[PDB]
Design a protein around this ligand. Structure first.
Ligand SMILES: CCCCn1c(N)c(N(C)S(=O)(=O)c2ccccc2)c(=O)[nH]c1=O
Ligand SMILES: CCCCn1c(N)c(N(C)S(=O)(=O)c2ccccc2)c(=O)[nH]c1=O
Ligand SMILES: CCCCn1c(N)c(N(C)S(=O)(=O)c2ccccc2)c(=O)[nH]c1=O
Ligand SMILES: CCCCn1c(N)c(N(C)S(=O)(=O)c2ccccc2)c(=O)[nH]c1=O
Ligand SMILES: [Cl-]
Ligand SMILES: [Cl-]
Ligand SMILES: [Cl-]
Ligand SMILES: [Cl-]
Lengths: 294, 294, 292, 292
């Protein structure tokens, strides 16, 4: 008788971006002024998630651990798992099964950057849906590269296709997914696609066929940035730099997000600022203590 | 017995950006794939404003007229005035006095670019306030360069200062202003500041002292882009290019905004596409006829 | 004596609406009008007498920008190209300007940068007979005049926008000609696309073994201004060089002064109007600083 | 025989958190690890025997990346610098590697580009006595070793990060030395900031009239990797060159192959693992294409 956790998939991108990524995983590469993984981590945090599993290669887990620790500095609890071989995104749920337990979950890709107004509220809406799965659809130039969602005249999602040659719309599914307690069992019964991968689109189609997939539009006023190529990586750095140098505010500073969620107080933030007091990042953390930012 | 119009200030930026701007006004320079003036024009249009006065130098008015015409192609009515000498932003209301008549108004700077989610609704809120004046405050790195707003502990605006050496906050007033029928008379009684200029901050302080200035925060999730330097111009081009190449959607395409406001129909948009059918811009206009974009 | 021509004519509707109000070559690349860059190139090549060819609409604009040239030690003239009917029209339009002198054409939207560019130009300019062009390795040779070389490195063919390019070597927008070019241009027939082709002019020199094709090495930057994306990149490229160095690329006043076409007192007068911005400050600092 | 050293040591906490997980010199600049660029520079200078010096933590990472060098016709060795105690420590750490040979140090985060760079390096490398450095005009000379010249153009002083720089000419991160440098390094005292200064090594050669200071001209790009903004720019600069040209900057496999240190069949083996991305495709295309 019986009476939301986060996952960040930051494993191998294979040899796709070699030789740039020969010495280090993509998700530890900087995007402008901070490691890439700070952005998806900050995203889960904005969604109010505090218990988070980082999935990386066996080779780079210690590097993630060194950067991020156990989370206690930022009011989180961070755990780690390895993905020996990159057998697909849906594998996150088998690797993370004991971590998830009987809870709701959120999966984010470790190389996905988001930006925009009321992003907190867009994340809240998905996080509040305690049943079913929630994903986001975003208009892209190149829907071929993604899971593509087709809508009917009423705006209802009626199909999902993984990397179709002739996409039914320009609406790609973003690398951010919210799931109720059915996801582990759905993942467990997945059979490898032709490429040997356990596909997240198959997971989302399972929910769709059950009438339990909410697809919310992430509007054109949001930036969902591309890190798939060297070119798009560079554009992602330039995009963040322009916003931060314009505003005097950072995007996805995890210390700041914890501070504003009240997961850490002013004294704790002051201590985090000390080691970096001579660079712009530590000076930014110090300015958060006295400035009112709306 | 007696029983909202837009202005775009696109006059002289002086010799500040010479020699780049020796042959042509700044507001006709491209930002990535379209003239700069398309962005503030699109902004007024998003606010639902259809009667718009463009203020330029006598030298470049014909160039604006050639680019934009009388508005009829886009469901607008565009008129023109000249600013013989750049005697300040508040001069817009004396130059535009007969154009404004007895109506409410909106002033936008011809070199200001905005971007973000629910921008339409942020513009709507200001446009709906039929009394008083409405402005926007945005957090910037360099508030010294702008009109700066100071808030009290409750978030109420309590002072405005033009280019203070020691800014009371990092909140700059953006170059977008909504005004009731009192603005022309307020402008008329302005005395030149020490620099010989008729200051918009003095106009906004007049409303503030009357308790009729609404200052809404434009959040950090919006991009209010800088075009003040060659560097910031270049960053503005890069910023737009990244969004448009990512999305397959344009920012501030005026034809598109008219189409979506129902100011022009599909047949009219088809005709606008014809002359540019061989380039990306005309091909974009054609794709708007058949695609559903949420 | 070698005369210069800059062809800054119409690029059609390809970059519209960005270029609806104004010719591309009057638009800035970072901190200065695009035409400063090819103008600076002719000046570096030692050319002082220069004809600028533009659309009828925009010739007043180039004129008010650049003047008769005298304040920079140049002698500038202007002419119009009514319609975009081929780069070779420059020699028809420019026939009486050229007269019996040597000539050099540069395209108004072409940007160059690199070490010893002066000597690369100086060598081509010194060759008093035949014609000299430059071949540059590019990713997309179909867009250009493509030069094919034999195993010995000799140029053996030229094709204008081939469907199947023979190499990745594009001819750049910089051409030096002897006294034969006008007469060769006058006998050109329009191509199938309806243009008087510069590549037909160059093939005429090639058939007589009088086309010197120099490699512009990979250490030189020949930047692309043909698309919006490429305009932007060119701006970022110049900005990175100038902000790194504290030195400008293709500042005509500097080049005049370094060629000794204007003296210290004239450079000082030029600085006066712009004194309150970076460009005039730059010009002032060139008076007292030794730059190697 | 001239030996090479690359100093790819710790840059402290200056770029943290971006460099918290990994040394800057193992981070990409556009399409390849930053250290490919100074490695490619030594190889272009003709240097095959090369010592890479890094933090104790990251030496395994440079090792697994670069191997013993044999697949690129190089002979690579590795050594650690326990603490960031000055660039001159390279010659102490590298003393037994150098032995009685000539040497050249390049900083692991310095990027160069330009025409005839090979000959600029080749000339310095050929000078068998004394030391050769390069002076480059920059906007912010206070950040560097600043060289002052007399009216005749002779170097007369060197200052490390002067408060009031004497010129705008910075010494770049590329240094060639004769057999004297180790012994000069061994006698260095720590500076006031607590470091063994490369500028004190260079001043020692200067006092004996044995410092050749060559101008690296404004036609060369010496790119800045010291700030986040400057990392980004360097990436945009390399991307613009490579996408324009269809040719890569500082591809070590290409440089080996062009120096004839590996043959056509070895380059082909190298291409195999990367065949499905741009980098391996590039290597394959170098087999059949003549590039001048
Ligand atoms: C709850 C505090 C939100 C303020 N905020 C913010 N809106 C942002 N954004 C710009 S964001 O909501 O779009 C965002 C937040 C986390 C990760 C990526 C974007 C941010 O990066 N950091 C912040 O502290
Ligand atoms: C009413 C149709 C709005 C859709 N839209 C849009 N949201 C935008 N934006 C990205 S925006 O609301 O931020 C905007 C609109 C006009 C000018 C600048 C930004 C746009 O540029 N063009 C559009 O057609
Ligand atoms: C005779 C003056 C040469 C120095 N020089 C120079 N080399 C350059 N170059 C960087 S350049 O030779 O590559 C060049 C010159 C004119 C136009 C484009 C590039 C320059 O822009 N301005 C200069 O004064
Ligand atoms: C002997 C091979 C020289 C051709 N070359 C070259 N010039 C360059 N350059 C662009 S470079 O000389 O300026 C250079 C070379 C190594 C590292 C940095 C720049 C190159 O990157 N790769 C090459 O194969
Ligand atoms: Cl939106
Ligand atoms: Cl916001
Ligand atoms: Cl070269
Ligand atoms: Cl040079």
């Amino acid at each position: 008788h019986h009476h939301r956790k986060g996952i960040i998939l930051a494993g191998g991108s294979g040899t796709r971006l070699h030789p740039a990524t020969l010495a280090i995983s993509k998700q530890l590469l900087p995007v402008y002024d901070k490691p890439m993984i700070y952005y998806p981590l900050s995203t889960l945090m904005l969604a109010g998630i505090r218990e988070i599993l980082i999935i990386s290669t066996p080779q780079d887990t210690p590097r993630f651990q060194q950067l991020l620790g156990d989370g206690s500095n930022w009011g989180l609890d961070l755990q780690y798992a390895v993905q020996p071989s990159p057998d697909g995104l849906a594998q996150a749920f088998l690797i993370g099964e004991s971590f998830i337990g009987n809870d709701l979950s959120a999966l984010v890709l470790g190389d996905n950057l988001y930006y925009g107004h009321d992003f907190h509220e867009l994340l809240g809406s998905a996080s509040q849906r305690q049943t079913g799965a929630s994903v986001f659809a975003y208009h892209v130039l190149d829907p071929e590269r993604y899971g593509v969602v087709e809508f009917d005249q009423g705006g209802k999602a009626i199909s999902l296709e993984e990397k179709p040659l002739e996409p039914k719309s320009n609406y790609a599914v973003t690398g951010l997914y919210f799931y109720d307690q059915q996801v582990v069992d759905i993942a467990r019964d997945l059979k490898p696609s032709p490429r040997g991968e356990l596909e997240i689109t198959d997971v989302n189609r399972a929910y769709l066929e059950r009438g339990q997939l909410s697809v919310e539009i992430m509007g054109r006023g949001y930036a969902w940035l591309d890190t798939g190529t060297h070119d798009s990586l560079l554009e992602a750095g330039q995009f963040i730099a322009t916003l931060e140098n314009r505003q005097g505010l950072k995007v996805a500073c995890p210390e700041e997000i914890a501070y504003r969620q009240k997961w850490i107080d002013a004294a704790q933030l002051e201590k985090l600022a000390a080691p970096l007091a001579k660079n712009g990042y530590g000076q930014y953390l110090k300015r958060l203590l006295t400035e009112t930012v709306y």
